[PDB]
């Protein structure tokens, strides 16, 4: 139902920016991760970017590398990741749910079948971390055939041909890593999807600066998982510090 168009329209009507936290599904456990995601949404998360544990995340840093190990240690498989995704959709109908995938888990049971199950569980978007826009043809076609938004990363070394491709083939939102001000202008010029800055977004000052720079919001990756990684022995004190951090970062976008 394009929850991104309706979230961005809302956040624009209140002159707000989006705060999108990232976590790995099933980290450190299935039940714990479900309560972690529930804590992020109540704290004030506008959207969700979720990762499926992959054995070889060659595009993620060590903090998320350990999140996959923490999830594999709990035994989380792509099968129960999607039953998690289904339960999360049935709890929060309006929030946009994004997936950070790797190409093998999508290709494994057929590309079109992977996006078919995302649509069955209510997933709004999918970014495949290791498929560049030059190799994106079969993935975005399967994603559009099941009303999924293909999310594309626009890196800091992007030339004009890349910005034109990300604007044309990208839906939902554009993943900015990042003066980003010149990159934000060109994406608005080429009518790209609203850009979310996701790169070391750690403090509330970076959420604020991203919005002022022209981006539609900020994506916090390692910052949330670091909080989970720190309080692995204290379950509630983890959620406690999770609620304080996300509501602080969400206020930074208002």
């Amino acid at each position: 139902m394009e929850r991104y168009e309706n979230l961005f329209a809302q956040l624009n009507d209140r002159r707000e920016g989006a705060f999108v936290p990232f976590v790995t599904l099933g980290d450190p456990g299935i039940e714990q991760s479900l309560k972690i995601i529930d804590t992020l949404i109540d704290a004030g998360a506008d959207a969700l970017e979720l990762g499926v544990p992959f054995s070889d995340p060659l595009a993620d840093g060590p903090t998320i590398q350990n999140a996959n190990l923490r999830a594999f240690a709990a035994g989380v498989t792509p099968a129960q990741c999607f039953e998690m995704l289904a339960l999360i959709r049935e709890k929060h109908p309006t929030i946009p749910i994004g997936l950070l995938m790797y190409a093998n888990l999508v290709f494994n049971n057929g590309i079109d079948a992977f996006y078919a199950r995302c649509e069955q569980v209510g997933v709004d978007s999918v970014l495949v971390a290791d498929v560049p826009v030059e190799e994106s043809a079969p993935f975005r076609q399967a994603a559009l055939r099941h009303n999924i938004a293909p999310i594309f990363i626009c890196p800091p070394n992007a030339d004009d041909d890349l910005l034109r491709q990300v604007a044309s083939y990208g839906r939902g939102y554009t993943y900015l890593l990042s003066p980003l001000h010149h990159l934000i202008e060109k994406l608005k010029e080429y009518h790209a999807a609203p850009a979310l800055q996701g790169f070391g977004i750690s403090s509330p000052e970076q959420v604020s600066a991203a919005v002022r720079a022209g981006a539609a919001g900020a994506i916090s990756g390692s910052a949330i998982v670091k909080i989970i990684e720190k309080n692995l022995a204290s379950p509630k004190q983890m959620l406690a510090e999770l609620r304080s951090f996300v509501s602080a970062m969400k206020a930074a976008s208002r």
């Binding site: 070889d56 060590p62 888990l105 800091p156 992007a158 890349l162």
Partner: protein, 394 residues
């Protein structure tokens, strides 16, 4: 957009994060430029001849084929500087690195022999070289770690994930994504994203080009089949390349069978894996039912690559080349047989190629055939593992 086709049939591609695409387009154009530059070719040939020892010998096996109608030749890449074929392409890649103005080299390795190959090339050409290796590979290959560090290389152990080659392959790409403007990723085999399969083939194809000229000089005809082991596929595609359009020449690649294919502990994804996407390429891979990539098992450390080069998967799908598997015990017997009968201690890698050649010769001993086996490396690194196994059996 690229200058060359990133795909071999349905296999290949550039399945890397978008940040790495400029690094690949830069590497491709420098390669295409170097291929048309006679000065680059002259310097490449100069290092191959006057530093590595090319051309390598083609040894006719006197005693191993007695009692049969098989003539067996051995392409002696074991006589190359470093002791393996890996020296050929790292010299070309390091020359490409200089052509792109790069001053650093990043390399992954598992058995440590590509790390030793990268370290010796960087030392010769004046490049700072840092090498990633699995922490479990660091413990079993401490001799090769000392070799790399003796030659001025920085060995960084990788405890990530499985702490093996596929995690070294990951950690190297992570470094290259932020350092590609000064550093060059020196990939180990004929796999990975375009243009690496094409580049490693062209920097290894002197193997088959020499073998062709030598077999025409010695036997006055092309071979009936060329046989080579396949970990990622660099020494095999280097032998196969100049014979592909020679359709009367058989192309046999040998994959590690480990403890047997039906046991699951093998390393033959081309014939007993499933096609997936990892390491920047679509190719047959060792993977679970859910899509998690496994490790290849083999008594041979150099055949630990959980996938295979895309040109090999293409050559197999069209029937141009045939791919078989050889167990640990078959390669071990081939190891012992070449020692007693020819005085050549082969690498446990290349023993898989020889083992299948002995099988072809033994199962049909009255078949008249001219076979060339690519001896991709010497086995002095393996005498310790061969010792412990023959000490344990009895």
């Amino acid at each position: 957009t690229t200058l060359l086709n990133p795909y071999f049939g349905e296999f290949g591609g550039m399945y890397v994060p978008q940040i790495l695409m400029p690094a690949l387009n830069q590497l491709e154009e420098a390669f295409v430029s170097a291929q048309k530059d006679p000065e680059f070719q002259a310097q490449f040939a100069d290092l191959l001849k006057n530093y590595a020892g090319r051309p390598t010998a083609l040894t006719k096996c006197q005693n191993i084929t007695a009692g049969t109608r098989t003539t067996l030749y051995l392409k002696r890449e074991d006589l190359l500087h470093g002791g393996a074929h890996k020296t050929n392409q790292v010299l070309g890649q390091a020359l490409l690195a200089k052509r792109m103005g790069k001053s650093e080299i990043i390399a992954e390795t598992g058995a440590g022999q590509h790390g030793v190959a990268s370290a010796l090339a960087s030392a010769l050409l004046g490049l700072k070289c840092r090498i990633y290796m699995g922490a479990k590979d660091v413990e079993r290959q401490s001799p090769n770690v000392f070799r790399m560090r003796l030659m001025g290389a920085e060995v960084i152990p990788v405890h990530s994930g499985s702490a093996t080659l596929k995690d070294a392959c990951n950690e190297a790409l992570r470094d290259w994504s932020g350092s590609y403007e000064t550093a060059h990723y020196m990939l180990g085999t004929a796999a990975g994203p375009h243009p690496y399969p094409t580049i490693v083939r062209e920097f290894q194809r002197m193997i088959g080009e020499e073998t062709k000229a030598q077999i025409l000089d010695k036997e006055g005809r092309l071979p009936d089949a060329v046989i080579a082991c396949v970990g990622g596929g660099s020494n095999a595609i280097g032998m196969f390349a100049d014979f592909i359009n020679d359709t009367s020449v058989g192309l046999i690649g040998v994959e590690p069978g480990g403890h047997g294919i039906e046991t699951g502990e093998h390393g033959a994804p081309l014939k007993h894996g499933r096609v997936g996407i990892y390491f920047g390429m679509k190719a047959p891979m060792m993977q679970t039912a859910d899509g998690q990539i496994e490790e290849s098992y083999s008594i041979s450390a150099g055949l630990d690559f959980p996938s295979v080069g895309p040109q090999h998967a293409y050559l197999n799908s069209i029937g141009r080349a045939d791919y078989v598997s050889i167990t640990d015990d078959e390669a071990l017997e081939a190891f012992k047989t070449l020692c007693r009968h020819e005085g050549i201690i082969p690498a446990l890698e290349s023993s898989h190629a020889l083992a299948h050649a002995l099988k072809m010769m033994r199962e049909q001993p009255e078949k008249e055939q001219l076979l060339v086996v690519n001896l991709s490396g010497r086995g002095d690194k393996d005498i310790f593992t061969v010792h412990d196994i023959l000490k344990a059996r009895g």
